[PDB]
Amino acid sequence: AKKVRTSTTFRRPKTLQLSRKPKYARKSVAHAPRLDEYKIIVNPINSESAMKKIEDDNTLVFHVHLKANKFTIKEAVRKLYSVEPVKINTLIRPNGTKKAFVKLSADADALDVANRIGFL
Amino acid sequence: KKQRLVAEAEAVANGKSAQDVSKKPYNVKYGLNHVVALIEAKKAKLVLIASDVDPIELVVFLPALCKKMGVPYAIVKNKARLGTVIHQKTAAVLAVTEVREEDK
Amino acid sequence: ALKTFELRKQSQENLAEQLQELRQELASLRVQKIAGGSGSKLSKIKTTRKDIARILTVINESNRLAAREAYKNKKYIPLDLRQKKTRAIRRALTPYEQSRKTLKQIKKERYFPLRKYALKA
Amino acid sequence: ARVKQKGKAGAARIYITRNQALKKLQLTLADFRRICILKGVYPREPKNKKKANKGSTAPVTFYYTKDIQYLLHEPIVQKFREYKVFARKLSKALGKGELETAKRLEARKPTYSLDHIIKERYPTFHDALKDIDDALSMLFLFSTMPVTDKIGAATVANCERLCAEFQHYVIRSNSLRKAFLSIKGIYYQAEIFGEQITWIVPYKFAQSVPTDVDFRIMHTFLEFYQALMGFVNFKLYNTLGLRYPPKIDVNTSLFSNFTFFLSREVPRFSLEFVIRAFGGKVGWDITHHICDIYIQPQWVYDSINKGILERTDLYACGATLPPHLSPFVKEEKEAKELSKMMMSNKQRKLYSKL
RNA sequence: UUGACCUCAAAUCAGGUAGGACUACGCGCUGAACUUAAGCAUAUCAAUAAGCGCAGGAAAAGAAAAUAACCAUGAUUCCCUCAGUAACGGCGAGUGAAGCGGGAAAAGCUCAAAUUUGAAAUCUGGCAACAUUUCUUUUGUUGUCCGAGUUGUAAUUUCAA
RNA sequence: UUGGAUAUGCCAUAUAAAGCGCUUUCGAAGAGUCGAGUUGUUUGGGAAUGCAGCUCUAAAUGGGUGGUAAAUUUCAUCUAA
RNA sequence: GGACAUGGGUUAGUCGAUCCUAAGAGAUAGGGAAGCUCCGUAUGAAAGGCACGAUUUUUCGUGCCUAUCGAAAGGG
RNA sequence: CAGAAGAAUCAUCGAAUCUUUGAACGCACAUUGCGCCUUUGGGUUCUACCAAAGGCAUGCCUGUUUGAGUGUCAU
């Protein structure tokens, strides 16, 4: 039974590609989550503009990690202070540190939360 | 071979005649150097040469060597058939030097 | 101060709560430092930092020893658990296979070794 | 972010077609069906098949990508590859005339255990009991058909052992509840651990192979079922503390004071089960002489469904037969015409069927 | 038609290995000119600098296809001597070894070419057992499968035999 | 921590292996390599010292070398690829 | 006082970058080169896919057809 | 200086950590740019979104597996 070629091209046949089944794991111990909430949130900001945002905009201002994004900041704030943010804005300061504006919901009082943190 | 060695080892452990419990092996001879030496020693009775030894110099002299030494020789099809006789993938040449009386 | 020996004789989960409590304490201390704190608080910052380091050391050593126990008497083990002397040392011939010899040399050394001799005056 | 491209999430992400699942698992169609028999993996249609086919409309069977991802880490797939290697080694030995190594290979033929598959498929033994009726029906069906090239004799022996051990378990525990006679066969209804089990046992006759069904479908089903019953019967015998496997060759007192005798014209294979299923005494080639006082076989069965012995005159040899009943069988104008503008809310489909 | 074999591919297949840096000293490749010759082209500088490749704690060399012409020596390396000599050179400027002899140190050997042929006696890997450790980090042993290998792996031989 | 001895303990199938001695004997010894010409480049090597490119290509007491090229005949020495 | 000192200050689904390709760079296949590296960009490459099937001798069959980088003034 | 209380800006050093990179290894890179694989987890939110961990370079070697060939045959 001679196989009929209808393409005038020979294209490399598909062969089984086994998945990796190592005899040993290259790393003995998996690293811990390198960016957890205690590393994500560095410090709050208590400058006069930071206070103004707290007392009017219902917004908390934090010094945060460079590798922290908006999603991780929201999860860190939710897990560290039990208040869910409605909005997060971030900027890299001219000194190289990241600063996050965290707008809380109407359900939460930014003044109260600042008081529990202790920097107010 | 392992079974025979185990059986004869038990025979030695039981202290019987290990040298006479076994019989002379009757089998085809293989291996290029071994077969060539047998042909030169006139011990080979029949020689079978693979038709497609990829480096042809390995067997190209064998028909002339067998003709000079008066050894009957044949070029048989394919290296693998000679291999499967000797339980290998390949055999360049096979040699028959001794057989049994019924196969004479 | 947290001392490593009673840190070592506890469980991994218990040390997990201690580590998380210490991290929260460090966060509170840093908030105190930026809101105005005394030298006592600022000294506790370094003490808490070292206690966190000691705990993390204990977790890692417990994890590594557990990996060593699991991979004990295994032909292939993780690279970080293997030896690390130098790259060349790992690539050199082992003393077993440096000392391998042919039967020709074994016979020569067996029958004609270097003899202990001496000369009279 | 930039514009996301369509067909990248949602139904088009959680659903996968059969052919892409084949390529995802690197399996043939037969092997993919095999693990789908062994595991619990069945097609699941999306509510929007067109959207889950990335806009295409061609008819497609869909599986959850989660199910196919789970099948990636199944050890049985590696066992399939191991057997394929084994088959070629055996074929190579036969082609080279290496009979001794072929025997060695057959001795070392790789087989796989279904213990993990059973545990994952039925996490609770109650669930295993619930999904046992299909296994019983298949085992009892194959226990009567003749052994042919497709069906293995050792497999038939295992079905015989499993069926015999289950039947004897029902006999000891008096778990049988109902027995119905249909043209298809005999439907037995038993109760264990609250769960009801119904299975059909055909008559012992000289049948023939239909030559239309695929026995490889049934081979995987039989192998899965044989493993299931082996574990289930093993648990049951340990639970009541008796040896497994047993060495036996084969209203608790309804038939206690009856020494029934069996003649060579009646289905002894079923009659022995049903009578001893209620503790009756059975002898085979005397109060009653069964032959088709002289009573008919339906008299016994109507008796057990009613819980009391029936009337002989109704079922005397050659008398009339009442219809065999299956115990399994158990303002208007304005109200009908009020279909205001509701479209999909109009549910007169129920009124048109029910 | 199934198979065997050969050749050639694929895999995030199992396990390994290579690069880069360093480069004082080692082995090579590549490779000038200024300079000198009172000019300058052969020559000299120089088989150098720059460039490039590859090593080690040393490297390289090494158990004579070596000298000698003796009453003969006896692997290699280095030192002293040979010796600014034999010799090469517009025989100009210049360049330029070796044998011996004395010393430092010394150490010898391995394959290919042989039919084990009354027996592939050989070896990697998988698995499982033990053992061992500069070391839970190291290094093996035994068994059992799969393979490698007769287009030749062990044993035996190396010319001094 | 290491070293070489020492005391014994155990495991070790010499059914093996080895040196030595005489053979009326036999003795396999590495090829686009040696060598030659030629062209470069090197050397103190001068009728080419080594290396390289090209052309031609051995042999079997054969092949190297004995620092003036050639043919020839001896003698030493050594035994490359 | 753009100087000196101390603090503070830049918040984006929609504005740009990111995405695309341009001239052009630049791997891979290969071939050069004592080499450093050079050339080469679908080429003398086996350069990847998609669909159907009661499961096929429970050892898969039957069909169908080009990287990347490079624009804060281009495209969007 | 403040500051606390097996101390110490001590010595040693065999256990660890070792960010982004770099031969630098998923692709890039005057873009914290752009991807893919596996597992796990998260929550007023659960076919969505997110997070975490572990992976994805090239050449070559041994082996394994899957193959291709009007390559050599057997059958």
Side-chain angles (χ1 to χ4, degrees):
Chain A
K2 316 334 199 243
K3 185 60 62 68
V4 175
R5 306 307 200 95
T6 61
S7 307
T8 278
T9 88
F10 183 99
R11 187 68 178 269
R12 184 181 67 75
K14 282 142 199 73
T15 51
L16 171 71
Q17 289 183 12
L18 286 159
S19 171
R20 273 198 185 168
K21 294 208 316 203
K23 306 290 187 170
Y24 62 99
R26 271 60 180 169
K27 282 182 63 160
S28 46
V29 181
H31 202 280
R34 290 164 181 91
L35 247 199
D36 70 299
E37 82 257 68
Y38 298 109
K39 299 194 217 180
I40 283 173
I41 307 289
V42 175
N43 267 339
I45 304 291
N46 60 67
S47 66
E48 274 335 275
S49 34
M51 311 321 234
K52 191 262 171 196
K53 292 198 81 68
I54 273 163
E55 319 170 304
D56 314 76
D57 311 5
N58 212 59
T59 291
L60 289 164
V61 186
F62 295 109
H63 179 191
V64 296
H65 204 264
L66 274 173
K67 299 288 94 176
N69 60 57
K70 284 173 195 341
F71 294 121
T72 71
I73 290 157
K74 188 177 255 213
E75 256 275 289
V77 165
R78 214 217 46 101
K79 185 175 188 31
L80 262 190
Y81 312 108
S82 298
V83 291
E84 58 96 21
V86 70
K87 186 178 180 181
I88 293 176
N89 283 179
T90 66
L91 79 175
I92 310 293
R93 290 191 279 178
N95 69 356
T97 61
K98 194 186 280 190
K99 183 214 303 188
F101 314 91
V102 167
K103 186 176 196 176
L104 315 178
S105 293
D107 211 326
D109 205 25
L111 290 170
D112 118 80
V113 176
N115 228 111
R116 319 201 280 81
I117 293 150
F119 75 100
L120 179 59
Chain B
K1 173 164 179 167
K2 183 77 159 62
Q3 159 51 300
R4 178 179 58 82
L5 271 289
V6 170
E8 293 179 353
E10 294 171 324
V12 171
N14 309 325
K16 64 182 305 303
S17 169
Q19 63 184 357
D20 306 330
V21 70
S22 179
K23 176 246 208 153
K24 185 174 184 171
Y26 278 120
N27 51 8
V28 75
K29 309 293 183 182
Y30 51 98
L32 189 55
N33 305 321
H34 176 46
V35 167
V36 161
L38 289 169
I39 295 157
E40 290 169 338
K42 288 182 68 72
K43 277 176 192 169
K45 299 298 293 295
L46 186 57
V47 171
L48 302 166
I49 304 166
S51 65
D52 58 325
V53 171
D54 191 344
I56 203 56
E57 300 92 334
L58 266 49
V59 290
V60 66
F61 66 92
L62 278 185
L65 176 63
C66 283
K67 179 74 179 185
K68 181 162 190 184
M69 305 273 336
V71 181
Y73 79 81
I75 298 175
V76 298
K77 299 299 289 293
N78 194 235
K79 54 181 79 171
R81 291 189 86 176
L82 309 187
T84 198
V85 174
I86 64 163
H87 301 305
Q88 306 286 339
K89 292 184 287 182
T90 325
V93 60
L94 299 197
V96 179
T97 84
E98 73 281 301
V99 286
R100 308 177 193 103
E101 286 56 357
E102 69 275 16
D103 291 331
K104 293 289 182 67
Chain C
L2 264 170
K3 295 182 284 292
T4 315
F5 54 99
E6 70 275 16
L7 281 175
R8 269 193 262 271
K9 54 190 55 183
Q10 291 157 12
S11 66
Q12 291 286 68
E13 300 81 18
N14 210 354
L15 293 173
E17 284 100 12
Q18 317 207 357
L19 175 74
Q20 227 63 0
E21 292 325 304
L22 271 178
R23 291 197 182 277
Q24 188 274 330
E25 157 89 320
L26 187 56
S28 304
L29 287 165
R30 279 192 258 104
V31 172
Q32 192 45 9
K33 101 187 292 188
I34 67 131
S38 67
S40 84
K41 309 292 194 293
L42 308 183
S43 74
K44 290 194 289 182
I45 296 170
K46 187 174 82 168
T47 287
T48 303
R49 261 193 303 118
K50 302 307 136 180
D51 296 7
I52 278 160
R54 293 187 192 102
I55 285 182
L56 282 181
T57 293
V58 166
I59 323 300
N60 189 179
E61 259 140 35
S62 266
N63 289 334
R64 290 186 74 95
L65 290 164
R68 291 206 176 277
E69 197 71 30
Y71 275 94
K72 178 78 191 83
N73 260 310
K74 284 266 209 268
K75 188 162 168 164
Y76 302 108
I77 69 157
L79 311 172
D80 40 303
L81 288 188
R82 288 163 192 214
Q83 70 171 345
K84 185 176 182 183
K85 311 199 167 51
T86 63
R87 169 192 196 112
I89 282 163
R90 282 181 256 125
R91 265 134 196 88
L93 283 169
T94 73
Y96 187 70
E97 65 184 2
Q98 186 33 267
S99 76
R100 292 306 88 193
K101 295 178 182 179
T102 58
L103 188 52
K104 188 174 190 169
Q105 273 285 324
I106 293 301
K107 292 159 163 178
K108 280 177 183 181
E109 298 150 14
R110 160 156 73 238
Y111 294 117
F112 303 100
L114 185 271
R115 295 303 288 279
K116 192 186 178 78
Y117 56 91
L119 272 176
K120 291 184 280 286
Chain D
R2 298 165 293 268
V3 160
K4 260 146 82 173
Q5 183 82 60
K6 295 170 77 174
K8 197 72 174 318
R13 211 271 292 161
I14 68 157
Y15 286 102
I16 195 164
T17 180
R18 172 200 68 202
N19 195 70
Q20 284 290 166
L22 289 180
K23 293 187 282 178
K24 179 73 174 158
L25 299 180
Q26 275 153 11
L27 296 184
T28 75
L29 184 70
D31 275 332
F32 172 74
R33 299 298 196 193
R34 283 187 64 189
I35 71 174
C36 286
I37 302 300
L38 298 186
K39 311 281 283 183
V41 183
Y42 40 90
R44 298 183 185 182
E45 73 278 342
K47 193 53 189 71
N48 222 278
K49 317 183 156 183
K50 181 173 165 185
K51 197 93 193 65
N53 213 6
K54 294 181 176 65
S56 183
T57 326
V60 167
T61 77
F62 290 89
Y63 299 85
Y64 278 166
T65 305
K66 288 291 189 287
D67 284 12
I68 305 306
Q69 284 282 348
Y70 195 69
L71 293 171
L72 280 173
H73 319 277
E74 210 58 36
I76 288 192
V77 167
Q78 190 66 80
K79 287 286 185 178
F80 289 170
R81 311 209 191 272
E82 286 172 21
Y83 182 92
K84 181 179 171 178
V85 176
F86 154 80
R88 284 180 174 181
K89 294 178 169 304
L90 195 73
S91 82
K92 189 177 57 179
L94 297 179
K96 287 178 82 73
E98 298 273 356
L99 269 296
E100 64 163 74
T101 65
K103 195 55 186 67
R104 303 172 75 252
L105 281 159
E106 292 173 26
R108 285 186 285 109
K109 172 175 100 174
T111 76
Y112 55 92
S113 74
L114 302 176
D115 60 355
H116 275 339
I117 312 302
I118 291 290
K119 280 192 284 187
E120 301 242 4
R121 199 161 173 172
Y122 310 118
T124 65
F125 302 118
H126 282 332
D127 285 330
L129 285 185
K130 292 181 178 69
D131 193 73
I132 208 168
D133 61 339
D134 286 345
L136 297 214
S137 300
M138 191 84 15
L139 292 180
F140 276 102
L141 169 59
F142 263 64
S143 68
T144 66
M145 57 184 339
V147 176
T148 47
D149 48 331
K150 288 281 189 179
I151 297 90
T155 71
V156 173
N158 252 27
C159 307
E160 294 293 328
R161 185 177 61 95
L162 292 173
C163 289
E165 298 158 300
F166 172 71
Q167 283 192 323
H168 187 273
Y169 177 89
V170 173
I171 286 184
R172 88 153 92 241
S173 67
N174 234 7
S175 298
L176 189 43
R177 295 315 165 236
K178 296 182 283 184
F180 170 76
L181 305 189
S182 169
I183 184 168
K184 319 296 183 184
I186 304 95
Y187 288 91
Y188 302 94
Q189 177 61 75
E191 281 285 359
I192 183 63
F193 284 11
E195 319 296 333
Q196 80 79 345
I197 296 92
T198 183
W199 72 94
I200 179 168
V201 170
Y203 308 120
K204 292 279 294 295
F205 279 139
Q207 302 95 15
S208 64
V209 55
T211 69
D212 290 323
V213 301
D214 293 358
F215 300 107
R216 287 159 292 183
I217 314 291
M218 329 198 104
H219 281 118
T220 67
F221 274 110
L222 274 172
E223 176 194 5
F224 174 75
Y225 291 156
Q226 285 176 355
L228 178 53
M229 311 282 338
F231 276 88
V232 166
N233 298 358
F234 174 71
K235 179 183 180 65
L236 292 187
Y237 277 49
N238 164 342
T239 310
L240 56 84
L242 188 152
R243 175 75 273 168
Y244 197 84
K247 309 57 52 185
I248 182 164
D249 46 39
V250 65
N251 92 320
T252 47
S253 72
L254 178 71
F255 292 154
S256 54
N257 63 6
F258 289 102
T259 59
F260 281 101
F261 190 86
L262 273 299
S263 60
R264 47 196 271 282
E265 57 261 10
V266 286
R268 165 205 161 199
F269 202 89
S270 192
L271 286 168
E272 284 188 352
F273 176 54
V274 299
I275 299 160
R276 180 34 271 201
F278 281 167
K281 189 68 176 68
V282 174
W284 57 280
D285 201 285
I286 295 152
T287 56
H288 293 269
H289 294 88
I290 305 102
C291 50
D292 208 1
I293 198 67
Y294 285 66
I295 61 171
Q296 280 194 354
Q298 187 162 351
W299 185 96
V300 183
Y301 280 173
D302 280 329
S303 304
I304 64 170
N305 303 28
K306 270 78 173 178
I308 54 172
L309 298 176
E310 289 313 279
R311 299 281 77 77
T312 293
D313 45 350
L314 188 65
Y315 286 139
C317 278
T320 188
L321 277 277
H324 188 71
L325 298 178
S326 179
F328 293 143
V329 167
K330 190 180 290 183
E331 295 96 9
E332 186 175 356
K333 186 256 288 181
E334 292 299 85
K336 186 69 176 176
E337 187 263 327
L338 196 142
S339 57
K340 299 289 94 176
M341 166 172 168
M342 296 127 75
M343 290 262 273
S344 64
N345 196 2
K346 297 183 182 70
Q347 292 296 319
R348 57 188 60 250
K349 57 187 74 58
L350 294 97
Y351 310 127
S352 66
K353 279 73 176 175
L354 186 63

